[PDB]
Design a protein around this ligand. Structure first.
Ligand SMILES: Cc1ncc(COP(=O)(O)O)c(CN/C(=C/C(=O)O)C(=O)O)c1O
Ligand SMILES: Cc1ncc(COP(=O)(O)O)c(CN/C(=C/C(=O)O)C(=O)O)c1O
Ligand SMILES: [Mg+2]
Ligand SMILES: [Mg+2]
Lengths: 389, 379
C-alpha cells in the first residue's frame, strides 16, 4: 500500500496546480485523434501527424496507438527526441540546410529512417555530394508549391522538378516522393473554399509526382496536408499520406476556419484572477502573453477572441468574455463587446480559476515546459514537451 | 572554438559589447538622478546577464514570476521584488523562499489580497514585506494615484496586520504607445508624481513607506528629474529592440540581441529568401506593426551585425521566416544575393518575447567566440 498512499498524497488536480498551466483535456484530445485517423482510413491514405504542435512523446504515442504511420517534425531536435523514444519513421519537413547534414547522417546511422526535403538544385547537390562522400543514400523528397503559401517548386515547373529529381537520383540518393502543405487554407472560412483548396493541393502534388515519373524518376510517396485541408478534402486519389498536426488539440483559429467547434478545443491555459480595475470592468489574470503567446490569428477572422476565450474551471466557454489585452505575465479579462462589465469582482472574485482557449495551439503550447494531461477523474499528469533546437 | 559560423541556427546571440554599453548607459543615468537601479530580469532570465547588471552597480532585481525568484536566489541574489499582484495561493511558495533567506518582496493593490497576506503571515510567524502598486497612467494594475481611501485601507491592513509595509511602486507601461521626447518626459513626470503622491499620503497617515519605486525602460531614459523616488525598475534596455527604437530611446545599432538564421531556400518570383528563423524563433510579437515603422518579424542584418535597411522578415511561419524587401518590390535575383547557407542576424520587435523562445543565449565576445548562457522557461 506504500506506493499507493504516497502517490495519492502527491497527485495534482486543477485546484492544486500552480497557474498559469497548459491543460490537455484528454477526452477531447482522444476524440480529435480518432476523428482525424478515421477520416484518413475512410480516404485509404496514411496519416503522418505533424508533432510540431505538441512535441510531446505521450501525445505522439496516442496518435500512433490510434493508427498513425510515422511522424512529421519541424526540427532535427524533434527527430532526435522522437527517435530516442522509439519512432523510426520521421519526415523532417523543412527545406534542408546543408550545415545540418552531419546531424541528419548521424540520426540515419543510429537507425532513424529520417527523410529530408529540398526545393532547389543547389540543396539537392549539397545532399548528394555529402551522401557520396559519406557512403549514405539519403532519402529526399521534393517540396511542391501548390498554393503560393511558402517554400516549394511550382507543380507545373517540369524543368526544375526534373533537374532536382535527376540531381538526387543520378547522384545516388533515394528520391522518395513529393510533399506539399497548402497553408493558404488558414485564410479561408467556408466549406466550399476549403474543399476547393484541398483539391488544388491534391491535384498539384499528384501533378508534380506524375511529371517526375513521366521522366523515368521514382516518386513513390505523394504527401499533402494542413489540418483544414485534411478535414475538407473530398477525394485523395494519387495521395499516399496526409500530414496534419494542430487537429490533435484544435484552437480558436481552427474554430473560425470552421473545421471544429470551440468545444473540440483540447488545450486550455489554467489561470488565476489576481486583481481588477472595477470601473473599467477588468479582471486581471496571471496568464499574459508569456502564457498565451503573442499569437493573434483570430484578429483577422470572423470573430476576434483577443488573447483567448475565457472558460470556467470546468472548461465551459463563458461567452462574451475574452482576454482583451495581455502583458508579459498579466492578462486583461474584459467583455469582447467593449462594454464595462458592472461588478466584475463578484463575477470574477480574486483567486478564481479560469481556463483560456488559445488562438493558436502550436504557439501557446511552445510557451510551456510541459502539459498537464487531465483525465476524466479530474487528476493531472505532467507530460513534458520539447523547447528550442 | 564555437563561433557564429559553427552554431546551429536559429540561435539567440547577445553582442556582449552592445549589452555592456546598454548596461552602462542606464546605470549612469540612474546615478545622475540619485536613484538605485533595480533591473527587471524578466527580459533575460539569465544569471550572467543579471550578474553584469549587478557588477555595473544595480541594487537588487525585479522578477515577474516566483520561478525567477527561485533561480536567482539559488544563484546568490537575495534582494528580490516579485512585481506582479500577489496570488494568495502562491503564499506557501513565497513563505518558503523567505524562510530560506531570500529577502523576497511582494506587491498588492487590493484590500482582499493584503488581508490574505497578513492573515497567512500572522498564522505562519512571517512579517512579509509588501509594497502597494499604484496605477499612475491607466495601463494595468494598481491603486488609482488619487484614490486615497483605497490606498490607506490597504496600507492599514498591512501595517496594522503585522506585515512590513515596505513601499509603493508603479509602472507607467503606457510609455509604450509614445514616440516623442516631450510625451515621454511628461509621462515620466506623471509616473514620478503619482508614485510620490501615494508615498506622501501613506506617510501623512502615520504609515511607513520607505521605498518609492517607478519605471519602464522609456520613462527611465526620458525622465528629467526623479525627486522623491528611491529606485527605478527597467529591464528591456539591457538588450533593446525595435519597439524601443521606434519609441525613440535607442537606435537599431544599439540592439544587443539578434537571432542568427540560415537561408534555406528562395521564392525567386517574389524576391523572397526563406530563413530557418520563423515565429518559433522570433516569437509572434508584432509590436512594431502599430508604430511609425513596421519591421515585420524583424530587421535583417548581415553576419557581422551590420543593419541592412530595407530587408525585413515580411512574414513568418513556425520554423520558416520570409525575408524580403520592406518596400514590397520583388528583389530581382534574390538567390544570387543570399545564396543557400548564407547566415544573417535578425533584430527582434520585442527582446523579452524573442528571448523567451530560446533555452539559452549565445554570448558573443570581441574575438568572435561564443559562450552559452542558459535562461529560464516556464513557471
Ligand atoms: C510541412 C507541413 N506539413 C503539415 C503541417 C500541419 O498543418 P497544420 O498545422 O496541422 O494545419 C505543417 C504546419 N505548418 C504551419 C502552419 C500554420 O500555423 O500556418 C506553420 O506554421 O509552419 C507543415 O509545415
Ligand atoms: C512592474 C514592472 N516594472 C518594470 C518593468 C520593466 O519595464 P521595461 O520592460 O524595461 O520597459 C516591467 C515590464 N512590463 C512589461 C512591459 C511591456 O509592456 O513590454 C510587461 O510586459 O509586462 C514591469 O511589469
Ligand atoms: Mg500552426
Ligand atoms: Mg516588454
Amino acid at each position: 500500500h506504500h506506493h499507493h498512499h504516497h502517490a495519492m498524497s502527491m497527485q495534482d488536480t486543477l485546484l492544486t496546480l500552480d497557474t498559469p498551466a497548459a491543460v490537455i483535456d484528454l477526452d477531447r484530445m482522444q476524440r480529435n485523434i480518432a476523428r482525424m485517423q478515421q477520416r484518413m482510413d475512410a480516404q485509404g491514405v496514411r496519416l503522418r501527424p505533424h508533432v510540431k504542435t505538441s512535441k510531446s512523446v505521450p501525445v505522439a504515442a496516442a496518435q500512433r496507438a490510434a493508427g498513425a504511420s510515422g511522424i512529421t517534425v519541424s526540427t532535427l531536435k524533434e527527430a532526435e527526441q522522437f527517435f530516442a523514444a522509439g519512432t523510426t519513421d520521421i519526415l523532417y519537413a523543412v527545406s534542408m540546410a546543408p550545415h545540418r547534414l552531419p546531424q541528419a547522417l548521424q540520426l540515419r546511422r543510429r537507425g532513424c529512417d529520417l527523410k529530408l526535403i529540398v526545393d532547389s538544385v543547389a540543396a539537392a547537390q549539397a545532399i548528394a555530394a555529402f551522401g557520396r562522400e559519406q557512403g549514405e543514400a539519403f532519402e529526399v523528397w521534393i517540396e511542391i508549391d501548390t498554393d503560393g503559401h511558402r517554400s516549394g517548386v511550382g507543380a507545373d515547373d517540369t524543368p526544375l522538378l526534373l533537374a532536382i529529381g535527376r540531381t538526387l537520383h543520378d547522384g545516388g540518393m533515394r528520391l522518395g516522393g513529393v510533399l506539399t502543405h497548402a497553408g493558404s487554407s488558414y485564410e479561408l472560412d467556408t466549406p466550399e473554399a476549403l474543399q476547393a483548396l484541398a483539391e488544388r493541393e491534391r491535384a498539384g502534388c499528384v501533378q508534380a509526382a506524375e511529371a517526375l515519373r513521366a521522366a523515368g524518376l521514382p516518386c513513390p510517396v505523394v504527401s499533402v496536408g494542413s489540418t483544414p485541408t485534411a478535414l475538407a478534402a473530398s477525394r485523395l486519389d494519387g495521395v499516399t499520406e496526409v500530414r496534419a498536426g494542430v487537429y490533435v488539440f484544435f484552437d480558436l483559429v481552427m474554430r473560425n476556419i470552421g473545421v471544429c467547434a470551440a468545444e473540440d478545443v483540447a488545450l486550455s491555459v489554467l489561470a488565476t484572477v489576481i486583481g481588477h480595475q472595477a470601473d473599467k470592468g477588468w479582471a486581471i489574470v496571471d496568464a499574459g502573453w508569456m502564457a498565451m503567446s503573442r499569437d493573434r490569428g483570430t484578429a483577422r477572422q470572423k470573430q476576434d477572441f483577443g488573447y483567448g476565450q475565457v472558460c470556467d474551471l470546468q472548461g465551459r466557454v463563458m461567452p462574451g468574455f475574452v482576454l482583451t489585452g495581455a502583458n508579459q505575465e498579466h492578462g486583461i479579462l474584459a467583455r469582447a463587446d467593449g462594454a464595462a462589465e458592472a461588478d466584475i469582482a463578484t463575477r470574477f472574485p480574486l483567486g478564481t480559476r479560469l481556463r483560456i482557449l488559445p488562438n493558436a495551439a502550436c504557439a501557446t503550447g511552445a510557451q510551456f515546459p510541459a502539459y498537464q494531461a487531465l483525465a476524466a477523474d479530474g487528476s493531472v499528469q505532467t507530460w513534458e514537451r520539447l523547447h528550442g533546437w
